[PDB]
Amino acid sequence: IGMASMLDAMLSRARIDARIDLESGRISSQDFSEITNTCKAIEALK
Amino acid sequence: RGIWKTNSETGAQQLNPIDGPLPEDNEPSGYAQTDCVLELIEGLDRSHPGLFETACQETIDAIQQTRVDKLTQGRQTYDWTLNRNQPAATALANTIEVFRKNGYKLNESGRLIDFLKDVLLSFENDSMEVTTHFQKKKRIRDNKKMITQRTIGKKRVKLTKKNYLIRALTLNTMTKD
Amino acid sequence: AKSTDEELSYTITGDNTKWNENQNPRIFLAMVLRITAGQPEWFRDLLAVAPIMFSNKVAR
Amino acid sequence: MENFVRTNFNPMILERAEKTMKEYGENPQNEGNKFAAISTHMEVCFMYSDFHFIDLEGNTIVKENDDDNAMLKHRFEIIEGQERNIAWTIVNSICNMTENSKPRFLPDLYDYKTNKFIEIGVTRRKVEDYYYEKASKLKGENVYIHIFSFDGEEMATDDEYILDEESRARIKTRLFVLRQELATALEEEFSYPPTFQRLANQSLPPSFKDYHQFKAY
Amino acid sequence: HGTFGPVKFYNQVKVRKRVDINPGHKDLTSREAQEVIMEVVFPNEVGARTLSSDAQLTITKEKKEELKNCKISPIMVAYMLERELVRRTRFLPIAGATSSTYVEVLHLTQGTCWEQQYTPGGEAENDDLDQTLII
RNA sequence: UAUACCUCUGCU
RNA sequence: AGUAGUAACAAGAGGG
């Protein structure tokens, strides 16, 4: 359920999944910047 | 034996047999009497106290909780967009798209009662716009002869207040096999 | 159970002819309004929509 | 005032303020009770999150750049101003990898260093009237409710201020200016539009002349 | 592990009755079962509600433990748990035992003119044993 | 206009 | 011709 957008919902999840997977998990520090750059790049394309 | 009257909005000639003359033979009649119906429905209410109440109470809760999703389920519906039968979900998506393209987006909430508002509000428009599709015979070169090519392009069409209303009150027909 | 030993019982194996062709949308509006008596008027009017559209229905 | 959030705040907060209010009934024209109050609920979250980050080991760092860049990470996450299904996915993803309490009602932020969920609730009441209204209700679990004041005074749980004194100083002056511009500034509906109403009038028994009339009968 | 006895031939009287058709249903409502399934297979994506009962807690820990590291579509896991947990009933004509494990094998145990005596594998529940002892 | 071919379709 | 039966199939559409 959600009045929010399909792309915007995916973007919110994309950031926070990368967060917890690094913050306390098995993903590298360089990869968190790589995911959020793409999310920012997608956010720029609207 | 009922009462003919022309409709204000559609111009359709409508027969009303109810509360009409009582039948005088055993042939199939449709002269139902409103007061006799209400007596039987009252009789049903007396014999099952609290039934109508809880029946309505459950139907109230449903209407509040029901989403627009729920009309993707079930059998084929007649699509007014194309004047043909289509799967439920595509007829829904088609009606939502054309409603969204005109001034109707209450269903953006997601709840079904808001989609139902959009349907009653859509009768007030007297210039309802629908994109149709049609075949176009293009010609392109190929390797070194020029062959004809069927392609499809879209064209917008406005509808009268009758035209749209007729289509929303239209029910499709076919033979049962 | 509710009859006496003096009473009779017959059973009609029953069919209604021309069932759909003689059931009227106006009568369905009477039913819906009576079944919903004393409920909120928005809920009465919402359920009343279908019978109304059926009364003004047109067939392809 | 209807243009209280529009003249003051930046363009990014206005689109956020438009979002989840559309659900019950009211709109930006009716009430001045919980219209603009939701807008600053997001503004406080940005001030809480911005200029505050964490080091490689696990220590607080209050920098000036504010764009992470590899080696340093955000200290807070914005729960308020999201969809309800996304809101709990934020909360639950955190509580999976750190065995903490799952709150009953919605929180607004979460501190990553200290592991504290933060329910924001600033208003014109002083301190004790709105600290123990929430605390004697959301009890047992350690939801860190930060009760500010409109003027200046401040009362947290055990005076255990996780945030440094430089940033919370400017947060008081942020609310001190918006306070000064207060003075100088469950239903359900369904009815017929007129076309369907006329159809409704024509779909009755012959004796009746009006939908309202038949419904009364 | 079922055991067969003899077939007796007699006029088999069948009472049309609503009965369980999901033997070993750990009895929960559909909403309660939805929370359990979400916890097990989609742990990160759970809503506001939590595991209210100890029925829900023990079943969730068990399912998480049993289904851990099994390469299969989560959609299929969610599907089977839905079928497994929620009680389901049907009107069926039944001669004799009405318990779920007997209902399961009506095709095998009863015909029009015959009873195939049969005891399913596993132990009978005390509830069922107490009810039948009284009768 | 006929005769060959070629392409899509076999519940839409 | 034949199928069939209250109306169809006995190829339809296109390269026009």
XYZ file of C-alpha atoms (C1' of nucleotides) in Angstrom:
663
model
C 0.000 0.000 0.000
C 1.270 3.487 -0.881
C 0.249 6.816 -2.465
C 3.997 7.433 -3.093
C 5.675 6.724 -6.444
C 7.010 3.346 -7.589
C 10.469 4.775 -8.398
C 10.577 6.859 -5.187
C 9.668 3.827 -3.036
C 12.467 1.807 -4.687
C 14.946 4.676 -4.136
C 14.131 4.961 -0.390
C 14.753 1.213 -0.049
C 17.935 1.338 -2.193
C 19.635 3.789 0.181
C 18.636 2.223 3.510
C 19.402 -1.380 2.414
C 22.947 -0.271 1.477
C 23.158 1.478 4.886
C 22.408 -1.509 7.186
C 24.331 -3.957 4.925
C 27.488 -1.857 5.569
C 26.864 -0.224 9.000
C 26.612 -3.657 10.650
C 27.235 -6.277 7.956
C 29.154 -7.728 4.998
C 29.348 -4.863 2.446
C 32.366 -2.595 1.828
C 32.671 1.173 2.385
C 33.357 1.956 -1.300
C 30.120 0.175 -2.357
C 27.831 2.369 -0.191
C 29.009 5.437 -2.139
C 28.544 3.508 -5.430
C 24.868 2.725 -4.606
C 23.986 6.259 -3.352
C 25.700 7.871 -6.398
C 23.375 5.824 -8.627
C 20.372 6.755 -6.418
C 21.397 10.431 -6.721
C 21.887 9.942 -10.494
C 18.386 8.403 -10.712
C 16.992 11.224 -8.506
C 18.496 13.716 -11.025
C 16.727 12.028 -13.990
C 13.397 12.591 -12.081
C -48.907 -2.747 -20.253
C -46.470 -0.420 -18.375
C -45.582 3.259 -18.808
C -43.208 4.495 -21.569
C -41.008 7.559 -20.905
C -38.052 9.090 -22.781
C -34.884 9.575 -20.712
C -33.600 13.123 -20.031
C -29.891 12.276 -20.393
C -29.702 9.440 -22.974
C -32.973 9.828 -24.934
C -33.617 6.084 -24.530
C -37.241 4.902 -24.552
C -37.741 3.272 -21.162
C -40.614 0.931 -20.176
C -41.716 0.915 -16.507
C -44.081 -1.995 -15.614
C -43.895 -1.798 -11.811
C -46.982 -0.832 -9.801
C -48.669 -1.416 -13.181
C -51.882 -3.262 -13.998
C -52.261 -6.641 -12.269
C -51.936 -9.634 -14.639
C -55.075 -11.419 -15.937
C -53.455 -14.632 -17.283
C -50.661 -17.085 -16.367
C -48.269 -15.796 -19.090
C -44.884 -14.417 -17.976
C -45.557 -11.027 -16.360
C -43.240 -8.364 -14.885
C -45.800 -6.164 -13.103
C -44.131 -6.237 -9.697
C -45.885 -4.173 -7.015
C -43.556 -2.013 -4.859
C -45.788 -2.289 -1.751
C -45.986 -6.099 -1.998
C -42.174 -6.257 -2.295
C -41.624 -4.010 0.734
C -44.110 -6.109 2.761
C -42.064 -9.269 2.031
C -38.749 -7.485 2.791
C -40.272 -6.163 6.042
C -41.455 -9.712 6.811
C -37.866 -10.865 6.292
C -36.612 -8.137 8.668
C -39.116 -9.144 11.415
C -38.307 -12.863 11.153
C -34.518 -12.232 11.420
C -34.018 -9.317 13.875
C -30.600 -7.614 13.585
C -29.779 -9.312 10.244
C -30.145 -6.253 7.991
C -28.261 -4.229 10.648
C -25.194 -6.502 10.823
C -25.415 -7.204 7.068
C -25.130 -3.440 6.456
C -22.532 -3.057 9.257
C -20.290 -5.678 7.566
C -20.849 -4.047 4.140
C -19.947 -0.627 5.675
C -16.625 -1.998 6.983
C -15.918 -3.569 3.583
C -16.477 -0.306 1.636
C -14.049 1.550 3.931
C -11.344 -1.167 3.733
C -11.763 -2.078 0.009
C -9.044 -0.981 -2.444
C -9.118 -0.339 -6.204
C -7.026 -3.557 -6.597
C -10.135 -5.675 -5.868
C -11.557 -5.019 -9.378
C -8.487 -6.636 -11.041
C -10.005 -9.959 -9.861
C -12.932 -11.741 -11.510
C -14.284 -12.358 -15.006
C -14.072 -10.245 -18.179
C -15.721 -6.790 -18.221
C -16.999 -4.711 -21.140
C -14.515 -1.919 -21.901
C -16.045 1.432 -22.887
C -12.581 2.633 -24.105
C -12.572 0.081 -26.975
C -16.263 -1.028 -27.251
C -15.161 -4.649 -26.609
C -14.790 -7.192 -23.801
C -11.400 -7.102 -22.014
C -9.834 -8.699 -18.919
C -10.969 -7.043 -15.665
C -7.601 -5.476 -14.817
C -7.055 -3.942 -18.286
C -10.590 -2.524 -18.375
C -9.809 -1.057 -14.935
C -6.409 0.343 -16.029
C -7.993 1.726 -19.246
C -10.807 3.477 -17.336
C -8.317 4.861 -14.746
C -5.997 6.131 -17.554
C -8.775 7.940 -19.458
C -10.177 9.250 -16.120
C -6.677 10.489 -15.190
C -6.239 12.094 -18.652
C -9.483 14.016 -18.047
C -10.105 15.756 -14.665
C -10.577 12.698 -12.378
C -7.946 11.398 -9.910
C -9.747 10.702 -6.586
C -8.825 7.000 -7.043
C -5.137 8.042 -6.681
C -5.868 7.496 -2.952
C -6.185 3.760 -3.667
C -9.549 3.180 -1.951
C -12.449 1.928 -4.096
C -15.147 4.373 -2.929
C -13.007 7.210 -4.400
C -12.857 5.417 -7.770
C -16.658 5.149 -7.474
C -16.873 8.948 -6.950
C -14.814 9.486 -10.148
C -17.379 7.360 -12.064
C -20.373 9.504 -10.979
C -18.383 12.741 -11.523
C -17.454 11.590 -15.067
C -21.091 11.868 -16.259
C -20.880 15.685 -15.917
C -18.138 15.986 -18.569
C -19.601 16.706 -22.037
C -16.289 16.282 -23.922
C -14.731 12.984 -22.738
C -11.433 12.316 -24.585
C -10.341 8.813 -25.703
C -7.249 7.748 -27.700
C -8.213 5.210 -30.400
C -5.771 3.284 -32.641
C -5.784 2.691 -36.428
C -3.632 0.986 -39.104
C -1.273 2.984 -41.367
C 0.382 1.580 -44.529
C 3.932 3.000 -44.569
C 6.487 2.364 -47.336
C 10.196 1.793 -46.535
C 13.203 0.651 -48.626
C 14.905 -2.749 -48.023
C 18.120 -4.550 -49.115
C 16.903 -2.753 -53.034
C 13.092 -2.909 -53.287
C 10.314 -0.964 -51.519
C 7.769 -3.072 -49.570
C 4.533 -1.915 -47.872
C 4.455 -1.992 -44.047
C 1.442 -2.103 -41.664
C 2.028 0.160 -38.612
C -0.285 1.582 -35.912
C -0.695 5.200 -34.724
C -3.059 6.793 -32.172
C -5.685 9.533 -32.582
C -7.651 11.387 -29.868
C -11.480 11.543 -30.076
C -13.863 13.642 -27.950
C -17.253 12.139 -26.961
C -20.673 13.770 -26.431
C -22.411 13.712 -23.025
C -24.794 11.128 -24.574
C -22.012 9.064 -26.235
C -20.088 8.587 -22.972
C -23.212 8.032 -20.837
C -24.596 5.480 -23.325
C -21.276 3.573 -23.131
C -21.188 3.613 -19.296
C -24.742 2.181 -19.223
C -23.839 -0.369 -21.957
C -23.705 -4.082 -21.222
C -22.199 -6.389 -23.873
C -23.982 -9.411 -25.389
C -22.996 -12.800 -26.781
C -24.415 -16.328 -27.021
C -23.860 -18.781 -24.150
C -21.983 -21.854 -25.394
C -41.392 -31.739 13.365
C -43.768 -28.721 13.436
C -46.733 -30.529 11.783
C -49.195 -32.924 13.450
C -49.856 -36.550 12.465
C -53.196 -35.398 10.987
C -51.489 -33.010 8.491
C -50.312 -33.549 4.882
C -47.095 -32.593 3.117
C -46.563 -32.018 -0.610
C -43.361 -30.815 -2.297
C -43.126 -28.675 -5.446
C -40.100 -29.540 -7.552
C -39.952 -25.945 -8.760
C -38.685 -23.814 -11.644
C -39.314 -20.087 -12.301
C -39.767 -19.313 -16.016
C -38.265 -16.121 -17.498
C -36.466 -15.307 -14.245
C -34.035 -12.563 -15.330
C -36.351 -11.004 -17.936
C -39.001 -10.196 -15.258
C -36.743 -9.078 -12.348
C -36.799 -5.231 -12.460
C -34.011 -2.706 -11.473
C -36.629 -0.419 -9.829
C -37.693 -3.264 -7.521
C -34.008 -3.850 -6.704
C -33.800 -0.155 -5.693
C -36.806 -0.653 -3.359
C -35.126 -3.692 -1.741
C -31.736 -1.998 -1.274
C -33.311 1.116 0.279
C -35.512 -0.949 2.656
C -32.623 -3.287 3.635
C -30.484 -0.204 4.415
C -33.221 1.684 6.373
C -31.743 3.760 9.220
C -28.145 3.458 7.948
C -26.073 6.482 6.839
C -27.522 8.100 3.705
C -24.150 8.018 1.890
C -24.143 4.207 2.226
C -27.755 3.971 1.013
C -26.996 6.191 -2.009
C -23.768 4.304 -2.838
C -25.506 0.910 -2.955
C -28.466 2.487 -4.790
C -26.154 3.369 -7.759
C -26.099 -0.111 -9.309
C -29.919 -0.595 -9.484
C -30.221 2.910 -11.017
C -27.658 2.208 -13.768
C -29.506 -1.098 -14.332
C -32.817 0.803 -14.752
C -31.186 3.008 -17.423
C -29.123 0.172 -18.967
C -28.618 -0.198 -22.701
C -27.592 -3.448 -24.460
C -25.057 -3.752 -27.311
C -2.142 31.318 7.857
C -2.209 29.349 4.577
C 1.063 30.882 3.266
C 2.989 30.412 6.559
C 4.974 27.393 5.276
C 5.220 28.824 1.708
C 6.973 32.185 2.313
C 9.303 30.988 5.120
C 10.589 27.491 4.251
C 12.712 26.289 1.298
C 11.103 24.658 -1.820
C 12.122 21.059 -0.872
C 10.102 21.060 2.409
C 6.892 22.290 0.655
C 6.608 19.144 -1.519
C 7.210 17.013 1.611
C 4.504 19.032 3.443
C 1.991 18.336 0.623
C 2.355 14.520 0.816
C 0.587 12.443 3.523
C -2.008 15.041 4.699
C -4.279 13.944 1.812
C -6.017 10.940 3.452
C -8.858 11.815 5.916
C -10.759 14.906 4.733
C -9.254 18.328 5.553
C -7.128 20.447 3.169
C -4.776 23.528 3.249
C -7.842 25.913 3.240
C -9.730 24.634 6.359
C -7.608 24.444 9.535
C -4.581 26.177 11.079
C -4.143 23.491 13.774
C -2.116 20.603 12.246
C -1.289 22.018 8.778
C 2.016 23.882 9.260
C 2.871 21.899 12.443
C 3.702 18.862 10.252
C 6.134 20.986 8.129
C 8.562 21.813 10.988
C 8.374 18.126 12.050
C 10.585 17.539 8.938
C 12.696 20.737 9.362
C 13.864 19.663 12.854
C 14.885 16.252 11.399
C 17.244 17.867 8.827
C 18.919 19.999 11.536
C 19.260 16.836 13.683
C 20.798 14.801 10.801
C 22.930 17.439 9.000
C 26.482 18.259 10.202
C 26.593 15.091 12.410
C 28.381 11.878 11.341
C 30.210 8.765 12.695
C 33.876 7.605 12.426
C 35.366 4.229 11.324
C 35.704 2.924 14.908
C 32.447 4.288 16.384
C 32.753 7.906 17.570
C 30.841 11.159 16.902
C 32.199 13.682 14.345
C 30.604 17.127 13.725
C 32.043 18.169 10.319
C 31.323 21.094 7.919
C 31.115 19.511 4.392
C 27.955 17.344 4.709
C 28.224 14.759 1.902
C 29.649 11.603 3.640
C 32.336 10.602 1.050
C 33.369 6.973 1.777
C 34.984 7.046 5.264
C 32.218 8.787 7.319
C 28.498 7.942 7.623
C 25.169 9.654 8.491
C 24.182 9.698 12.195
C 20.368 9.932 11.751
C 17.674 8.641 9.358
C 14.462 10.486 8.408
C 11.425 8.325 9.320
C 8.911 11.217 9.361
C 7.761 12.320 5.885
C 7.609 8.865 4.273
C 4.986 6.256 3.335
C 3.648 4.059 6.181
C 4.900 0.806 4.570
C 8.375 2.381 4.058
C 8.353 3.908 7.587
C 8.321 0.510 9.348
C 10.853 -1.008 6.888
C 13.266 1.673 8.173
C 12.564 0.748 11.821
C 12.644 -3.046 11.341
C 15.831 -3.119 9.204
C 17.636 -1.382 12.082
C 16.231 -3.657 14.830
C 17.220 -6.831 12.880
C 20.996 -6.180 12.942
C 20.897 -4.748 16.499
C 18.625 -6.658 18.941
C 16.629 -3.658 20.252
C 13.022 -2.814 21.180
C 10.390 -2.518 18.427
C 8.126 0.471 19.299
C 4.301 0.267 19.122
C 3.592 3.684 17.563
C 5.647 5.475 14.863
C 8.988 7.140 15.763
C 10.506 10.077 13.806
C 14.321 9.524 13.966
C 17.000 7.048 15.119
C 20.524 7.765 16.435
C 23.041 5.258 15.002
C 25.836 5.718 17.593
C 23.795 5.627 20.844
C 20.971 3.392 19.444
C 18.039 5.646 20.451
C 14.677 6.084 18.656
C 13.494 9.727 18.865
C 9.809 10.790 18.988
C 9.697 14.554 18.264
C 6.833 16.551 19.842
C 7.497 20.269 20.407
C 4.578 22.615 21.220
C 3.452 25.700 23.232
C 3.230 23.722 26.526
C 6.255 24.120 28.823
C 7.917 20.769 29.731
C 6.173 18.555 32.349
C 2.732 18.708 30.630
C 3.994 17.046 27.395
C 6.926 14.945 28.758
C 4.809 12.738 31.083
C 1.802 12.650 28.667
C 3.893 10.563 26.208
C 6.225 8.873 28.764
C 3.357 7.350 30.832
C 2.023 5.545 27.720
C 5.101 4.625 25.621
C 6.827 3.221 28.767
C 8.926 0.067 29.341
C 10.684 0.510 25.992
C 13.364 3.259 25.912
C 11.948 5.699 23.329
C 14.099 8.834 23.793
C 11.528 11.682 23.775
C 13.328 15.050 23.401
C 10.975 17.709 24.848
C 12.107 21.207 23.801
C 10.315 24.482 24.590
C 9.037 27.333 22.398
C 11.242 29.897 24.242
C 14.483 28.242 25.437
C 14.264 25.827 28.420
C 14.892 22.099 27.808
C 14.111 18.841 29.702
C 15.229 15.439 28.331
C 15.295 11.978 29.974
C 17.910 12.107 32.802
C 19.291 15.263 31.058
C 21.069 12.718 28.805
C 21.724 15.004 25.829
C 23.227 12.856 23.039
C 23.578 15.903 20.728
C 26.392 18.458 21.361
C 25.668 22.000 22.660
C 26.588 23.912 19.457
C 23.844 22.438 17.215
C 21.028 22.390 19.822
C 21.765 26.098 20.494
C 20.801 27.025 16.897
C 17.746 24.684 17.059
C 16.355 26.858 19.913
C 16.845 30.063 17.841
C 15.162 28.306 14.863
C 11.980 27.777 16.937
C 12.384 31.164 18.734
C 11.766 33.029 15.419
C 8.772 30.910 14.240
C 7.076 31.379 17.664
C 7.075 35.168 17.075
C 5.110 34.864 13.770
C 2.063 33.107 15.375
C 0.626 36.449 16.583
C 1.472 38.581 13.509
C 0.189 35.937 11.015
C -13.536 11.207 11.070
C -16.244 11.451 8.356
C -17.465 9.832 5.095
C -19.319 11.428 2.158
C -21.012 10.166 -1.022
C -23.678 12.019 -3.008
C -24.997 12.192 -6.556
C -23.794 14.839 -9.006
C -26.675 16.425 -10.967
C -26.651 14.112 -14.044
C -26.855 10.900 -12.005
C -29.415 12.566 -9.703
C -31.653 13.042 -12.779
C -31.095 9.378 -13.709
C -31.936 8.472 -10.095
C -35.226 10.402 -10.462
C -36.121 8.496 -13.672
C -35.405 5.009 -12.232
C -38.343 4.906 -9.771
C -41.859 3.493 -9.784
C -44.251 5.579 -11.971
C -46.167 7.308 -9.119
C -42.962 8.820 -7.651
C -41.332 11.935 -9.130
C -38.121 12.286 -7.097
C -35.327 10.080 -5.674
C -35.542 11.814 -2.265
C -39.338 11.221 -2.298
C -39.121 7.456 -3.030
C -36.317 6.953 -0.481
C -38.610 8.550 2.148
C -41.522 6.269 1.162
C 2.339 -45.680 9.183
C -1.398 -46.382 8.880
C -2.853 -49.772 9.817
C -5.661 -51.545 7.930
C -8.342 -53.717 9.540
C -11.113 -55.685 7.794
C -13.846 -54.448 5.438
C -17.388 -54.756 6.791
C -20.355 -54.506 4.391
C -23.381 -52.575 5.650
C -25.737 -49.633 4.923
C -23.340 -46.764 5.677
C -25.137 -43.759 7.238
C -23.468 -40.430 6.343
C -24.175 -37.146 8.161
C -23.427 -34.031 6.045
C -21.394 -31.925 8.465
C -18.777 -29.136 8.458
C -15.366 -30.600 9.379
C -11.678 -29.711 9.338
C -9.709 -30.633 6.186
C -6.237 -29.404 7.255
C -4.806 -31.971 9.729
C -2.126 -30.470 11.985
C -3.401 -26.909 11.542
C -1.766 -24.889 14.317
C -4.971 -22.958 14.932
C -4.650 -19.231 14.081
C -6.653 -16.584 12.222
C -5.672 -15.433 8.729
C -4.344 -12.077 10.017
C -2.344 -13.807 12.781
C -0.955 -16.289 10.202
C 0.021 -13.422 7.863
C 2.226 -11.870 10.598
C 3.902 -15.265 11.181
C 4.617 -15.823 7.465
C 5.978 -12.264 7.061
C 8.328 -12.713 10.049
C 9.688 -16.013 8.690
C 10.209 -15.306 4.963
C 10.174 -11.471 4.666
C 11.685 -10.486 8.075
C 12.764 -6.940 7.142
C 9.400 -5.940 5.591
C 7.032 -6.497 8.572
C 4.451 -3.793 9.423
C 3.509 -2.130 12.726
C 2.064 -5.197 14.518
C 4.187 -7.743 16.405
C 4.037 -11.366 17.612
C 1.187 -11.035 20.137
C 0.726 -14.646 21.352
C 3.150 -17.391 22.475
C 1.446 -19.531 19.816
C 2.776 -17.056 17.225
C 6.256 -16.806 18.828
C 6.941 -20.563 19.133
C 5.644 -21.245 15.587
C 7.785 -18.396 14.135
C 11.004 -19.531 15.863
C 10.330 -23.168 14.847
C 9.589 -22.251 11.206
C 12.659 -19.988 11.031
C 14.724 -22.865 12.491
C 13.269 -25.632 10.249
C 13.234 -23.623 6.984
C 16.712 -22.006 7.481
C 18.938 -22.100 4.358
C 16.643 -23.886 1.884
C 17.027 -22.840 -1.770
C 13.434 -22.352 -2.939
C 11.196 -19.453 -4.029
C 9.984 -17.467 -0.957
C 6.588 -17.253 -2.740
C 6.239 -21.040 -2.444
C 7.245 -20.961 1.274
C 4.672 -18.239 2.002
C 2.078 -20.257 0.051
C 2.653 -23.562 1.907
C 2.688 -21.866 5.334
C -0.646 -20.167 4.494
C -2.127 -23.590 3.657
C -0.470 -25.226 6.702
C -1.337 -22.759 9.484
C -4.871 -21.502 8.770
C -7.731 -23.874 9.665
C -10.012 -24.779 6.722
C -13.387 -26.547 6.692
C -15.892 -28.087 4.268
C -19.341 -29.636 4.366
C -18.765 -33.357 3.699
C -20.831 -36.523 4.211
C -19.111 -38.498 6.996
C -19.776 -41.934 8.436
C -18.021 -42.404 11.781
C -14.918 -40.525 12.970
C -14.961 -36.767 12.275
C -11.367 -35.931 13.335
C -9.147 -34.271 10.698
C -6.910 -37.312 10.024
C -9.985 -39.487 9.401
C -11.656 -36.796 7.231
C -8.470 -36.824 5.133
C -9.087 -40.459 4.111
C -12.885 -40.578 3.572
C -12.441 -41.880 0.001
C -10.478 -44.833 1.436
C -12.517 -45.557 4.618
C -16.170 -45.287 3.433
C -18.275 -46.171 0.417
C -21.999 -46.591 -0.097
C -22.122 -50.114 1.359
C -18.802 -50.592 3.168
C -16.384 -49.510 5.907
C -12.643 -50.081 5.491
C -11.425 -50.018 9.121
C -8.246 -47.920 9.264
C -6.109 -46.148 11.861
C -3.877 -43.319 10.559
C -0.266 -43.081 11.720
C 0.497 -40.911 14.739
C -1.263 -40.438 18.069
C -4.819 -39.225 18.645
C -5.226 -35.901 20.494
C -6.578 -36.059 24.073
C -9.437 -33.688 23.132
C -10.643 -36.179 20.515
C -10.049 -39.148 22.850
C -12.053 -37.510 25.685
C -14.960 -36.640 23.360
C -15.153 -40.203 21.983
C -14.757 -41.795 25.455
C -17.832 -39.850 26.615
C -19.882 -40.984 23.594
C -8.745 -9.789 -63.923
C -6.280 -14.487 -63.586
C -2.153 -17.632 -62.060
C 2.020 -18.403 -59.062
C 4.578 -17.198 -54.868
C 5.769 -14.705 -49.950
C 4.354 -12.978 -44.737
C 1.229 -12.973 -40.059
C -2.852 -15.712 -37.477
C -5.632 -21.026 -35.285
C -9.899 -18.777 -28.206
C -8.422 -12.247 -28.897
C -20.659 -31.487 -52.255
C -20.339 -31.908 -47.073
C -20.424 -30.170 -42.022
C -24.207 -28.387 -39.661
C -28.841 -25.985 -37.438
C -32.554 -20.675 -35.610
C -26.096 -19.115 -38.118
C -22.036 -20.159 -39.327
C -17.812 -23.173 -41.385
C -16.549 -24.576 -46.238
C -9.462 -20.317 -44.303
C -9.113 -14.860 -42.628
C -5.793 -10.664 -43.038
C -1.642 -8.526 -45.654
C 2.309 -7.939 -49.489
C -3.352 -3.416 -53.083
